[PDB]
Design a protein around this motif. Structure first.
Motif, short mmCIF file in Angstrom:
data_model
loop_
_atom_site.label_atom_id
_atom_site.label_comp_id
_atom_site.label_asym_id
_atom_site.label_seq_id
_atom_site.Cartn_x
_atom_site.Cartn_y
_atom_site.Cartn_z
N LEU A 103 0.83 -1.19 0.00
CA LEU A 103 0.00 0.00 0.00
C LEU A 103 0.88 1.26 0.00
O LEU A 103 1.66 1.50 0.92
CB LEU A 103 -0.93 -0.01 1.21
CG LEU A 103 -1.71 -1.32 1.42
CD1 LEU A 103 -2.78 -1.09 2.45
CD2 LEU A 103 -2.36 -1.77 0.15
N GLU A 106 1.77 3.49 2.93
CA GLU A 106 2.57 2.91 4.00
C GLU A 106 4.06 3.21 3.77
O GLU A 106 4.92 2.83 4.58
CB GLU A 106 2.34 1.40 4.10
CG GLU A 106 1.07 1.02 4.82
CD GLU A 106 0.98 -0.48 5.12
OE1 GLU A 106 0.99 -1.29 4.16
OE2 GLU A 106 0.90 -0.84 6.32
N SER A 234 5.37 -2.08 7.44
CA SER A 234 4.34 -3.09 7.37
C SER A 234 4.73 -4.56 7.48
O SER A 234 3.85 -5.43 7.54
CB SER A 234 3.57 -2.88 6.07
OG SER A 234 4.47 -2.81 4.98
N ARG A 331 0.95 -0.84 13.21
CA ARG A 331 0.62 -0.77 11.79
C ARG A 331 -0.77 -0.13 11.69
O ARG A 331 -1.79 -0.77 11.98
CB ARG A 331 0.60 -2.16 11.15
CG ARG A 331 0.42 -2.12 9.64
CD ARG A 331 0.55 -3.49 9.02
NE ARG A 331 0.54 -3.40 7.56
CZ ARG A 331 0.56 -4.46 6.75
NH1 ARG A 331 0.58 -5.69 7.27
NH2 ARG A 331 0.58 -4.29 5.43
N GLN A 333 -3.15 1.04 9.17
CA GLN A 333 -3.67 1.07 7.80
C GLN A 333 -4.94 1.93 7.65
O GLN A 333 -5.37 2.62 8.58
CB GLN A 333 -4.01 -0.35 7.35
CG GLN A 333 -2.95 -1.35 7.70
CD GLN A 333 -3.17 -2.67 7.01
OE1 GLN A 333 -4.06 -3.45 7.37
NE2 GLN A 333 -2.35 -2.94 5.99
N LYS A 334 -5.54 1.88 6.46
CA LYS A 334 -6.78 2.62 6.20
C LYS A 334 -7.98 1.69 6.37
O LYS A 334 -7.99 0.56 5.88
CB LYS A 334 -6.78 3.20 4.77
CG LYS A 334 -6.03 4.51 4.59
CD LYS A 334 -6.21 4.95 3.13
CE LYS A 334 -5.26 6.03 2.70
NZ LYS A 334 -5.42 6.20 1.22
N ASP A 337 -8.72 -0.83 3.60
CA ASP A 337 -7.77 -1.90 3.39
C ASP A 337 -7.88 -2.95 4.47
O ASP A 337 -7.85 -4.16 4.18
CB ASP A 337 -6.34 -1.38 3.35
CG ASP A 337 -6.00 -0.75 2.03
OD1 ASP A 337 -5.93 -1.50 1.03
OD2 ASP A 337 -5.79 0.49 2.00
N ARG A 443 -1.82 -7.22 10.98
CA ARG A 443 -2.67 -6.34 10.17
C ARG A 443 -3.83 -5.73 10.98
O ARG A 443 -4.34 -6.37 11.90
CB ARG A 443 -3.24 -7.13 8.98
CG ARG A 443 -4.70 -6.87 8.66
CD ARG A 443 -5.26 -7.93 7.71
NE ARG A 443 -4.69 -7.86 6.35
CZ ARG A 443 -4.84 -6.84 5.51
NH1 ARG A 443 -5.54 -5.78 5.88
NH2 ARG A 443 -4.29 -6.88 4.31
#
Length: 1073
Positions: A103, A106, A234, A331, A333-334, A337, A443
């Motif tokens: 991504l 990231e 990540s 981590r 993320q959005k 995702d 994740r």
RNA sequence: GCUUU
């Protein structure tokens, strides 16, 4: 007393262009001297005159009074950081390798390149979310470097390894400048756009990592992680910690601890041969190669060197690396995702359905009251978190808006809208709002914020399920009062040359869509069987509603933000957010292992010594009729992986004869380890806690990591506490709280003046200060009173009460009103009013401690009375237990070697008392340890009324109010309450066996009457005192008690009137688990 | 300001 000395060096280092020590005393004449001294110092400072003469003049104040705080008059402009940094910024800045992360966002691109505009910007992916600044962290590291600049020998080497590393952080930061934070410790777009997005979070992780480096190995590890982390955001943690699962199987067992029939640790001298099939070695190599392809060099080599012999003796390095990797940060993320990743289940569904039935069969057939009054139970339990949407709420005469669950329930009832009979949909018409969960290495996962109809429909049933788990051993996490040591003990027990252990990470399967059909279907089928077991209207409806929630979820839809838009997408996977989440997930994980194990045997024959599910992992110990070979391990493993594979479950399944590795713990070489990856300078999310709470939490965090094997320098932790605890009086006047203010057991306690040793006031000044702080423990909130007076609110309290009890209300009633007045604290405005009030009170208190009619007894007062009646004496306790928890620091470890350890939690709630059980049988009410403590001490007649008032029948209420058990409960409730006041279950103490025969010998307490309460406190006080001395001195002492008989009666009265203390330190232990 | 268990 070194914190006070340290604080001055830091202030002097930070500001250079005055400091005003503020003292106080419990003695009147001394205090006036303190008052005079403070005045002269201010006046001299207000005239640029030397305070040297005054210190000599008020020598007595410095010598005997108690430092309360330090005034800081600094006329600079919060700069210095920019100036300070350059001397350390000589190395070459780091260059983000924008090719490492999948991504795009990231990758450490320039902020602007990710958010070309101020309106597209968001810190949601890098926010440290902590109430301390990057600038302060830099200042703290520099201050430490200056102090240990002229060190020698090994201490110098520690400075040198650190100076190097800080250069990388410094050089990189300078190339862009130091990001300035706002009043809310957030980093905005203007400061951010020039600099690399992840610059600030990375700096915090690196600083935290480097300030925890001592040995050359720590330095090698810190350097690789720091450099790799700047580009890789990540996979570095997953890549670094992944080899660990293979490693535990490798090391041989040469003597380990096990679990005996009494459920306690016991040393076994056995030997178990580690059997590893060649395939496992290839798998490990692939993991090592992957680390290498990712830039990692030093870390892979260390594992490789270790692999030659694989000695549990040189295994600490492998553990150290595993703990370290977590400190790279979280981590983040959005949402989209994180959200996006998401015929043979007949056996699996049936087990889930059957397990659900066993857990409720007995409660349902009898017609359990809790099942019948489930709705009432749900309401009392109800939290004050989020219901999902921000509603407009009118209270009394105030139109305010909140998203809080407690607020929504009251408003809905006040308008006939409250309808729990109707369980709202969660599909396309009513999309589920989303919550997130961020962890290091793994994740990001999503969380359902379902409406309160869901919590209520599920709360009673889950509670019954948990109770079944409580006495079922398969459920490692819920069984008895058990702690992690018993679980550790159970795996080791059956290990031998004819059995292999099978551990499996099933975190991926839970979120799998394959999983949801068989899951919900299994629970529902079970619910139906339960329904055909009774005719009770209350039971069927509560039971039926639970069935409805599973059905609504079967086809849910979610609201995922996608910029500044909220796309709605059909989510077909089991996420969490339900009340049944942990219990259900546990039921499913256990069902899955049983299903795999059953399938495998058709081929090979083994015996099931133990099966377990613990959180996101599951495992089992199988026994064979022959000796285990490398070939056998490979065959069992391939078949297990294939069975998991057929079910379409992406899981990590391993097989070994010596160790196991799961998310909570890992057993290598017969020894027990616990990852020490709690991050310090970066948080998962932004809560509503204060800087002081945050400072206490960081200290708590520092303590858990230190016990677990990762130690961040204490001086650094102390420096962070000084910055966090400070309070601004103006723009050039900052007040810093003293060591006494910070550590004394009060409502403002943040840490122990000595790690692992909790002190209590044994001097008058300490007592005087302790009483003063309590005086301003609870502060008023107008917004809170308004709503506390509103109709909609009072009716809610009244409605709940009229449904619960029959006869009269008040010990119970006063509590219900408060419990609810508290859940309003989640509401920022009320919380904000409280903090401002606390700060003004605190500023005045530090300036010149007030008075107080005291009249309130605490734990410290009881202890203070006992102290003078004990005679110390050097004693000797030989070390007799081998170390099973290798990482424990040396002082803590030594206590375990001498007195032993425990595998349980001491009852500190009073649940095991007969009265509490009696209330449970007839009421859905749950009194706290504190309420039970006041109630048990009430007059015989009052207790009978209280039990009846809660629906307890007369023959039962009458029988108890006299019996042997009621007298016994009295001692038991106090004992439970006292343990609770002494944190016997937290920190370092939870480890120690307080009933050690070896510990017991050191306590010589002659009975001078026979009065339980006094006997229990004197022995406990003695055990803590002896243990603390051992923790600080390395040697032991024997305690003799000559407590008068006349005295004991006075003490006994004192004991039944102890008040509990609330403080950041207290909150921090609660916060940990 | 958002932030289930």
């Amino acid at each position: 007393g070194k914190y006070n000395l340290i604080l001055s060096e830091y202030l002097s280092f930070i500001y250079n262009s005055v400091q005003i020590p503020i003292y106080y005393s419990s003695n009147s004449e001394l205090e006036n001297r303190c008052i005079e001294f403070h005045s002269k110092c201010l006046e001299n400072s207000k005239n640029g005159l030397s305070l040297r003469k005054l210190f000599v003049e008020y020598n007595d104040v410095i010598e005997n009074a108690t430092l309360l705080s330090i005034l800081s008059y600094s006329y600079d402009k919060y700069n210095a950081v920019e100036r300070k940094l350059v001397k350390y910024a000589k190395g070459k800045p780091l260059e983000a390798d924008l090719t490492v992360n999948e991504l795009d966002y990231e990758n450490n691109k320039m902020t602007s390149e990710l958010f070309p505009t101020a309106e597209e910007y968001t810190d949601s992916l890098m926010d440290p979310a902590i109430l301390t600044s990057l600038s302060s962290n830099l200042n703290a590291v520099m201050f430490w470097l200056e102090k240990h600049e002229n060190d020698v020998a090994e201490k110098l080497k520690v400075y040198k390894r650190r100076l190097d590393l800080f250069t990388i952080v410094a050089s990189t930061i300078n190339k862009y400048g130091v990001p300035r934070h706002n009043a809310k410790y957030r980093y905005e777009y203007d400061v951010m756009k020039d600099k690399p997005y992840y610059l600030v979070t990375w700096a915090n992780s690196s600083i935290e990592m480097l300030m925890s480096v001592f040995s050359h190995d720590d330095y090698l590890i810190a350097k690789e992680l720091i450099v790799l982390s700047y580009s890789n955001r990540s996979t570095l943690a997953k890549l670094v910690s992944s080899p660990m699962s293979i490693l535990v199987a490798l090391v041989d067992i040469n003597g380990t601890f096990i679990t005996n029939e009494e459920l306690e640790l016991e040393f076994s001298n056995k030997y178990v041969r580690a059997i590893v099939p060649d395939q496992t070695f290839d798998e490990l190599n692939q993991m090592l190669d992957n680390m290498r392809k990712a830039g990692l060099v030093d870390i892979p080599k260390m594992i490789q060197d270790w692999l030659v012999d694989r000695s549990i003796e040189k295994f600490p390095l492998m553990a150290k690396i595993y703990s370290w990797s977590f400190h790279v940060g979280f981590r983040k993320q959005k949402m989209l995702d994180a959200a996006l990743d998401q015929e043979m289940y007949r056996e699996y569904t049936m087990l889930i359905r059957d397990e659900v039935v066993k857990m409720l069969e007995e409660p349902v057939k009898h017609d359990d009251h809790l099942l019948r009054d489930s709705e009432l139970a749900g309401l009392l339990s109800m939290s004050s978190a989020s219901n999902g949407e921000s509603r407009q709420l009118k209270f009394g005469r105030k139109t305010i808006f909140s998203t809080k669950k407690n607020m929504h329930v009251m408003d809905d009832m006040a308008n006939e809208r409250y309808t729990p009979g109707i369980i709202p949909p969660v599909n396309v018409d009513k999309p589920i709002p989303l919550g997130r969960r961020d962890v290091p290495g793994r994740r990001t996962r999503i969380i359902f914020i379902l409406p309160y109809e869901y919590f209520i429909a599920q709360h009673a049933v889950v509670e019954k399920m948990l109770i079944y788990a409580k006495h079922t051993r398969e459920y490692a996490e819920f069984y008895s009062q058990s702690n992690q040591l018993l679980s550790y003990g159970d795996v080791t027990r059956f290990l031998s040359n004819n059995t292999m252990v099978l551990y499996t990470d099933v975190s991926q399967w839970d979120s799998s869509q394959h999983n949801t059909q068989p899951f919900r279907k299994g629970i529902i089928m079970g619910l139906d069987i339960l329904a055909n077991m009774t005719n009770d209207a209350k039971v069927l409806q509560t039971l039926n509603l639970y069935k409805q929630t599973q059905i609504n979820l079967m086809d849910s839809y979610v609201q995922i933000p996608d910029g500044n838009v909220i796309k709605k997408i059909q989510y077909g996977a089991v996420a969490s957010g339900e009340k049944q989440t942990k219990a259900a997930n546990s039921i499913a994980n256990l069902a899955l292992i049983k299903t795999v194990l059953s399938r495998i045997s058709n081929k090979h024959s083994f015996a099931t010594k133990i099966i377990r599910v613990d959180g996101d992992d599951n495992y089992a110990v199988l026994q064979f009729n022959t000796e285990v070979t490398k070939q056998m391990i490979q065959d069992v493993s391939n078949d297990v992986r294939e069975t998991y594979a057929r079910m379409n479950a992406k899981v990590k399944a391993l097989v070994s004869t010596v160790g196991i590795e799961i998310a909570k713990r890992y057993i290598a070489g017969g020894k027990i380890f616990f990852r020490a990856g709690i991050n310090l300078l970066n948080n998962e999310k932004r809560g509503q806690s204060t800087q002081w709470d945050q400072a206490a939490i960081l200290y708590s965090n520092y303590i858990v990591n230190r016990l677990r094997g990762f130690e961040t320098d204490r001086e650094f932790i102390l420096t962070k506490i000084m910055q966090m605890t400070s309070v601004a009086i103006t723009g050039s006047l900052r007040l810093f709280p003293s060591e006494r203010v910070l550590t004394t057991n009060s409502t403002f306690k943040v840490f122990d003046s000595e790690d692992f040793i909790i002190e209590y006031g044994t001097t008058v000044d300490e007592v005087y200060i302790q009483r003063a702080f309590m005086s301003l423990s609870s502060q008023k909130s107008g917004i809170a009173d308004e709503i506390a007076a509103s109709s909609t609110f009072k009716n809610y309290v009244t409605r709940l009460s009229e449904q619960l009890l029959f006869s009269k209300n008040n010990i119970v009633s006063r509590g219900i009103a408060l419990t609810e007045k508290a859940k309003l604290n989640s509401y920022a405005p009320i919380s904000l009013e409280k903090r401002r009030a606390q700060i003004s009170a605190l500023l005045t208190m530090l300036q010149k401690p007030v008075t107080f009619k005291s009249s309130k007894i605490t734990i410290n007062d009881i202890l203070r009375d006992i102290k003078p009646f004990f005679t110390v004496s050097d004693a000797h306790l030989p070390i007799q237990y081998q170390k099973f928890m290798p990482t424990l620091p040396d002082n803590v470890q030594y206590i375990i070697q001498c007195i032993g350890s425990r595998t349980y939690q001491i009852e500190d709630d009073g649940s095991k008392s007969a009265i509490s059980r009696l209330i449970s049988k007839y009421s859905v009410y749950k009194p706290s340890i504190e309420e039970l403590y006041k109630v048990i001490s009430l007059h015989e007649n009052e207790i009978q009324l209280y039990l009846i008032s809660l629906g307890i029948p007369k023959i039962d209420a009458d029988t108890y109010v006299g019996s042997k058990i009621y007298s016994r409960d009295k001692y038991r409730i106090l004992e439970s309450y006292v343990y609770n006041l002494l944190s016997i279950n937290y920190g370092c103490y939870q480890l120690f066996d307080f009933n050690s025969p070896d510990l017991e010998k050191l306590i010589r307490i002659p009975f001078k009457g026979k009065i339980p309460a006094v006997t229990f406190i004197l022995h406990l006080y003695a055990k803590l005192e002896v243990i603390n001395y051992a923790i600080k001195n390395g040697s032991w002492i024997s305690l003799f008690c000559n407590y008068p008989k006349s005295e004991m009666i006075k003490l006994w009265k004192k004991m039944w009137n102890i008040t509990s203390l609330r403080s950041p330190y207290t909150n921090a232990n609660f916060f940990q688990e």
